[PDB]
Write a protein that binds this ligand. Sequence first.
Ligand code: GDP
Ligand code: SO3
Ligand code: CL
Length: 323
Amino acid sequence: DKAAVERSKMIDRNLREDGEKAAREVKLLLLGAGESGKSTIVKQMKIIHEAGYSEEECKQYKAVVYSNTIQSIIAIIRAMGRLKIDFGDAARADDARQLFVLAGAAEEGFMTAELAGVIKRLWKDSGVQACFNRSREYQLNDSAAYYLNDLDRIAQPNYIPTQQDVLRTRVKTTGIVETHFTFKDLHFKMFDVGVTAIIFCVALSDYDLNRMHESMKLFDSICNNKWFTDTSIILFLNKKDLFEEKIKKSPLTICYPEYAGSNTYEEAAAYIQCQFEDLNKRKDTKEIYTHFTCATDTKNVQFVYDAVTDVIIKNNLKDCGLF
Ligand SMILES: Nc1nc2c(ncn2[C@@H]2O[C@H](COP(=O)(O)OP(=O)(O)O)[C@@H](O)[C@H]2O)c(=O)[nH]1
Ligand SMILES: O=S([O-])[O-]
Ligand SMILES: [Cl-]
């Protein structure tokens, strides 16, 4: 292990009376466009490094799960009208109406056998499925399929959200979120918006929604900024799972008209990676550390973060103070 050898070369703890107990601090900036996966990464840090989410904590997210699900089905049904897409079985029009009656009379997210029934039949309808598959034409939660396909479990009277259910939530976050965790004896200070490292998140599946080019313009700015010269810049190309499902049927050319590679996961994901890394104007001075992630996948984030941490250890320790 080169990172272990590297950190063992430090001597600054010896300048402190109780140096071996001192906390080495790493400030990490979590950046990226809305819905790029920043909150999800923060949640994985709690899960992997700080003992996860207990059941009682998971119960607090129940009505958020309900709310996300309701939002999803409504967005699809409403889009059917704008896109002129007919129901398969014409009796679903009553279920569509009933969905609005129930959502319209309620205080917040909820679930009943009646609502579950309405939504199940809607999600199973061929016309609804056809509208769902044109989601790129409107605005729809990426977890729409996840919750809807599992509606039966979510709908049970004694339903308790799983960690995956909580990770899959979209929560309206405002302002700056700061989280703290210890890993490999490093005391991380992570800021979801002069720093040790930046993690920049990109939603790969946004390519056909222009979102990707806005993500690029933002990365161009950040990557090449003055304050970040000695900052380790990490690129998370996220939602690789949604990208892989989607790249089979929707072409990269929608985002990058000049693209002439095959429309496969391997070629299209590589191309995207190059588009972002090429935005680095100091190529011989700064390296970009790129990882393809699925932020909802605890194992993948654990692995990826372990590698991101070895890079910080080999590269940035000298600028990390003791406290
Ligand atoms: N399938 C999938 N969903 C993801 C991934 N990353 C984030 N999400 C979901 O995308 C939505 C937005 O993510 P979020 O962390 O809130 O983005 P933020 O605005 O940058 O904080 C949430 O519902 C997440 O559950 C991913 O890699 N794969
Ligand atoms: O001294 S290093 O191991 O934080
Ligand atoms: Cl989303």
